[PDB]
Amino acid sequence: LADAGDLSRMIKHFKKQKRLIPERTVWKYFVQLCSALEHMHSRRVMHRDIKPANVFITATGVVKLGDLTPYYMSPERIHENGYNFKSDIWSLGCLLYEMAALQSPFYMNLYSLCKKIEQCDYPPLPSDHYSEELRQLVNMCINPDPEKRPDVTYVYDVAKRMHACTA
Amino acid sequence: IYCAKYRAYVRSRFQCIESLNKRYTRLRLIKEHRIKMELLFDPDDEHSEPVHTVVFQGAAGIGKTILARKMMLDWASGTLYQDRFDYLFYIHCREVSLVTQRSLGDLIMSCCPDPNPPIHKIVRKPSRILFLMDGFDELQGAFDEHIGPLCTDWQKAERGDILLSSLIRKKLLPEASLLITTRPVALEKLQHLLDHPRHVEILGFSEAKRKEYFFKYFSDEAQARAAFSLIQENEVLFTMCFIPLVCWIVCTGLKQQMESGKSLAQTSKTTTAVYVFFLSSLLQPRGGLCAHLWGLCSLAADGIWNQKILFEESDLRNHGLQKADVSAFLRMNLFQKEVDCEKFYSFIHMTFQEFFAAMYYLLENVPGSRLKLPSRENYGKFEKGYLIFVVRFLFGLVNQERTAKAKKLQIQPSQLELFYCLYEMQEEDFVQRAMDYFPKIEIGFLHNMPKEEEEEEKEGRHLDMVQCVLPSSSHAACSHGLVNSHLTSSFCRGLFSVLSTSQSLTELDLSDNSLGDPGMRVLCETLQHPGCNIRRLWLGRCGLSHECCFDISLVLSSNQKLVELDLSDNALGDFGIRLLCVGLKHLLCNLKKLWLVSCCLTSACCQDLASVLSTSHSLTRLYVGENALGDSGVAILCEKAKNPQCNLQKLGLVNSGLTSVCCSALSSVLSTNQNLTHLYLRGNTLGDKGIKLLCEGLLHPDCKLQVLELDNCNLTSHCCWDLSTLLTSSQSLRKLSLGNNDLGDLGVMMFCEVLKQQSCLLQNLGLSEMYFNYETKSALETLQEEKPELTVVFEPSW
Numbered sequence: 001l002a003d004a005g006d007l008s009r010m011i012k013h014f015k016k017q018k019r020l021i022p023e024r025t026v027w028k029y030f031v032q033l034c035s036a037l038e039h040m041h042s043r044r045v046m047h048r049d050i051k052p053a054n055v056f057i058t059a060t061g062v063v064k065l066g067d068l069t070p071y072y073m074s075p076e077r078i079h080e081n082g083y084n085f086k087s088d089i090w091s092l093g094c095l096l097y098e099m100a101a102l103q104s105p106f107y108m109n110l111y112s113l114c115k116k117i118e119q120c121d122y123p124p125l126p127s128d129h130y131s132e133e134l135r136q137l138v139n140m141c142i143n144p145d146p147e148k149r150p151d152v153t154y155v156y157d158v159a160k161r162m163h164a165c166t167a
Numbered sequence: 168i169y170c171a172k173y174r175a176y177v178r179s180r181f182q183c184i185e186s187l188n189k190r191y192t193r194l195r196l197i198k199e200h201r202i203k204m205e206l207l208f209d210p211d212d213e214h215s216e217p218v219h220t221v222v223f224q225g226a227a228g229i230g231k232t233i234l235a236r237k238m239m240l241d242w243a244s245g246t247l248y249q250d251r252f253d254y255l256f257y258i259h260c261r262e263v264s265l266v267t268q269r270s271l272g273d274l275i276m277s278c279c280p281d282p283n284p285p286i287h288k289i290v291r292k293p294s295r296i297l298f299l300m301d302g303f304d305e306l307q308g309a310f311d312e313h314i315g316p317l318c319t320d321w322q323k324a325e326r327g328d329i330l331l332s333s334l335i336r337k338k339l340l341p342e343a344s345l346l347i348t349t350r351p352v353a354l355e356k357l358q359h360l361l362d363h364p365r366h367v368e369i370l371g372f373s374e375a376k377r378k379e380y381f382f383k384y385f386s387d388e389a390q391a392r393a394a395f396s397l398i399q400e401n402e403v404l405f406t407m408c409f410i411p412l413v414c415w416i417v418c419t420g421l422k423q424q425m426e427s428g429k430s431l432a433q434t435s436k437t438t439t440a441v442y443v444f445f446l447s448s449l450l451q452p453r454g455g456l457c458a459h460l461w462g463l464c465s466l467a468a469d470g471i472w473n474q475k476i477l478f479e480e481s482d483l484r485n486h487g488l489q490k491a492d493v494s495a496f497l498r499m500n501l502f503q504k505e506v507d508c509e510k511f512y513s514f515i516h517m518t519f520q521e522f523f524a525a526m527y528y529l530l531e532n533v534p535g536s537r538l539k540l541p542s543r544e545n546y547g548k549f550e551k552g553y554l555i556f557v558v559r560f561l562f563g564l565v566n567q568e569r570t571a572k573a574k575k576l577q578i579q580p581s582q583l584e585l586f587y588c589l590y591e592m593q594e595e596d597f598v599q600r601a602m603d604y605f606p607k608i609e610i611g612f613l614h615n616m617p618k619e620e621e622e623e624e625k626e627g628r629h630l631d632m633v634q635c636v637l638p639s640s641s642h643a644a645c646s647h648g649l650v651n652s653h654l655t656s657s658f659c660r661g662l663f664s665v666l667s668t669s670q671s672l673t674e675l676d677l678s679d680n681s682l683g684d685p686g687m688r689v690l691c692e693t694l695q696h697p698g699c700n701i702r703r704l705w706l707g708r709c710g711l712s713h714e715c716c717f718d719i720s721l722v723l724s725s726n727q728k729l730v731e732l733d734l735s736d737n738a739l740g741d742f743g744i745r746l747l748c749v750g751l752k753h754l755l756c757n758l759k760k761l762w763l764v765s766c767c768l769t770s771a772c773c774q775d776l777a778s779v780l781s782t783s784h785s786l787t788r789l790y791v792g793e794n795a796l797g798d799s800g801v802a803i804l805c806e807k808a809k810n811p812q813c814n815l816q817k818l819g820l821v822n823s824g825l826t827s828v829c830c831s832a833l834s835s836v837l838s839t840n841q842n843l844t845h846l847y848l849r850g851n852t853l854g855d856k857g858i859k860l861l862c863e864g865l866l867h868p869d870c871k872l873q874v875l876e877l878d879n880c881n882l883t884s885h886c887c888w889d890l891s892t893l894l895t896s897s898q899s900l901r902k903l904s905l906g907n908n909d910l911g912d913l914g915v916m917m918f919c920e921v922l923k924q925q926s927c928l929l930q931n932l933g934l935s936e937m938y939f940n941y942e943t944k945s946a947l948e949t950l951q952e953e954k955p956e957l958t959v960v961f962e963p964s965w
């Protein structure tokens with residue numbers, strides 16, 4: 001655990017600033033998230049709790065990764081099916097939509113959340129302020145069915161290029 | 168045994184291209200993730216554990232496949248290669264490029280049959296076999312190298328489709344390496360095809376290496392001192408000669424003019440002008456040729472429009488104008504047929520073919536190219552750079568350039584698709600046509616360059632490694648844009664000269680790059696002179712230190728334009744703050760907001776910050792938010808507004824310490840000081856004493872206050888009724904939020920009881936992170952809508 005702060009602080013900063021987080025910073029946090037997550041999963045350890053409050057960063061920018069029915073709850077897991085790795089891809093999609101447009105995709109009660117899940121709805125990101133490749137990644141990581149979800153080994157090597165061309 | 172035979176064959180194959188052994192200069196190889204081709208492919212366990220493949224990438228003509236030929240001839244020379252490998256196979260992706268289903272290919276010139284049933288026995292145990300696939304941008308078909316429907320077996324003796332074999336033996340079960348070289352644009356076809364790759368970008372001709380090129384090309388005193396300096400004295404074309412192909416263009420584009428003498432440095436601007444001048448240097452003394460040029464033009468690009476890259480013993484040209492002019496073009500090109508080595512014909516580097524494709528789409532549906540565009544980019548770039556330059560060279564060179572009315576009908580659709588590809592599309596890695604090169608090579612600078620004054624939409628480009636002549640050429644022409652660039656570290660005046668002249672309408676942010684040590688000390692002279700400049704400014708976690716501060720203290724004093732400045736997370740806390748406050752306090756300033764968060768600051772500076780509110784009536788919203796300061800500044804915080812008429816609207820505050828001292832100081836300012844709207848206290852380790860002093864402070868009648876937040880507390884279950892009764896007594900605030908507060912069921916019970924009659928606040932309320940019971944949650948969701956004076960309540964988790 002670091003003593004600088006967390007990611008939710010880093011979103012409340014811009015919420016005070018009334019400015020959207022620029023894309024180089026977005027990818028700069030997202031890649032060191034993804035590499036630590038794939039390092040977790042390659043040694044066969046799941047997380048189950050991918051939450052923006054569970055993201056802890058130094059003041060230099062290094063995400064010192066924290067260790068191992070809520071609102072963040074996948075369509076299969078909110079209908080009490082299997083928490084798969086596709087649930088981790090679901091939570092990475094909701095986390096990225098939070099760091100993209102300053103709030104969650106579905107943000108009370110839990111019926112209408114399941115209803116719009118069955119209707120597969122979410123507000124669209126604006127075009128002019130985020131990369132369209134990121135929105136295509138978003139649409140590929142909030143798919144309802146588990147088999148339509150590419151894993152961390154695809155998205156991390158995607159984001160590696162997205163960051164290396166935005167250093 | 169078979170090693171040395173075709174080793175000598177590849178020695179003969181790549182020795183003949185031009186030589187090219189005393190004509191090879193080593194280049195730069197970069198992979199940042201934040202080289203040496205000897206053991207480049209290391210799967211070493213630093214961060215590249217299971218890898219078997221790299222991808223080389225640069226722009227059009229950086230020298231990838233000539234580097235591959237140097238590797239082939241180098242290992243074919245030996246050249247200290249400790250034998251990691253045994254047999255290396257050049258696979259030219261513009262000869263294997265068909266779809267018509269041949270099996271494995273290792274016999275090329277149809278020699279005696281190689282031991283192919285032992286050629287895969289020597290893969291399994293010795294993994295010393297490597298296939299340099301080269302030229303991914305022109306693997307023809309229908310731009311279709313997708314996920315394979317069916318795989319092939321790991322012996323490949325069957326005549327499977329190479330669209331379904333090399334894609335598969337690239338994709339799955341390889342146990343053999345491949346180093347594909349490509350433009351990065353066609354990385355996307357290769358991307359979602361899963362590889363686990365490495366990547367290397369290739370960066371070539373610097374100053375001294377270009378000097379070594381001009382020495383190794385010519386004779387050492389004829390023009391190696393004369394042409395070098397005569398091309399050196401140009402404002403561009405030394406920057407443009409980062410690309411080695413432009414160096415090849417000029418060194419064999421005035422070697423023919425050393426006989427005529429002294430025409431060297433002229434009319435040299437772009438990537439377009441070097442190509443058109445070199446083509447004029449070849450095609451000068453025959454203009455007969457007026458039909459030969461159109462015949463060459465009219466058939467050069469159907470080999471990518473219908474996707475047949477090499478011209479197949481020029482039987483296509485045997486249809487269109489096969490005479491001795493074909494041999495003349497072959498002799499003046501010198502690399503058309505001989506590099507194909509049996510019967511086929513080609514262009515030299517096929518950016519010539521994209522160039523003649525630009526000639527084709529001049530002289531032969533350009534929205535078809537528009538829709539097909541991003542799957543490849545060079546044809547669009549070269550046709551644009553051709554276009555306004557030959558509008559210019561309508562009155563320049565002779566009118567052989569167009570034979571026009573087709574020119575305007577592709578410049579107005581060019582800005583039309585530019586409008587279409589900007590206004591609802593930002594693609595950052597692979598879909599180009601939203602880049603400033605396409606206007607750059609265009610410069611007619613009165614409409615077609617300043618039409619992007621309209622279609623700009625508050626953009627921000629990305630200058631990590633481009634030579635900054637291009638964007639400085641671009642946005643200094645137009646007059647809009649709230650731009651946020653990135654990383655102008657080494658070069659200097661490509662920042663200064665354009666951020667000075669932004670006087671029409673501008674804005675800036677350079678956040679989270681690393682401006683250097685005089686990158687702190689740059690932008691002083693950019694901002695220390697009038698006109699119109701930055702209105703508000705952010706520098707988020709940039710490279711900044713103490714030595715900047717006095718410098719920007721001067722831009723504090725000299726500015727009648729600044730209204731909001733941020734120094735976030737850059738360690739500016741001691742002795743530069745003295746410079747900052749004397750620069751701000753020194754002169755009258757029109758500064759209204761200021762931001763100083765998280766900089767490594769302490770209480771040894773706030774005594775200076777007491778003066779700036781009392782003197783300046785313009786500094787109004789000082790977010791000093793939660794940099795590491797604590798106690799003993801607290802009386803200075805009290806003297807910040809002991810007097811009224813401070814003209815301080817908001818005050819963001821800091822994670823503080825002992826509750827009684829800070830809130831006793833805060834009681835005086837929240838009682839006496841008028842026009843104080845907001846107050847963001849947060850992260851403050853407080854108890855009952857601080858909120859008790861707070862409600863005694865707001866007990867002071869006719870003290871005005873808007874929105875207030877108290878976040879971190881474990882409140883007793885009596886203060887809520889006290890504060891809500893004070894708020895029904897007087898509209899002392901408007902809203903409030905609560906965060907990680909373990910305040911229990913009894914507090915919210917008293918809260919909904921006092922909220923049942925005469926809701927105290929009038930804007931908003933927030934209660935988060937609460938695992939309490941639902942019988943009161945029914946009342947919370949109940950009593951918000953019939954009396955919507957309380958509009959929103961935070962519902963914690965359910």
Ligand SMILES: Nc1ncnc2c1ncn2[C@@H]1O[C@H](COP(=O)(O)OP(=O)(O)O)[C@@H](O)[C@H]1O
Nearest residue numbers: 190191192228229230231232233234411412415
């Ligand atoms: N090391 C070098 N020495 C001399 N010329 C070079 C060198 N590298 C590249 N060039 C120039 O670049 C061109 C070769 O680039 P090439 O490898 O064919 O590009 P690509 O890999 O994109 O096809 C040649 O015309 C040559 O003049």
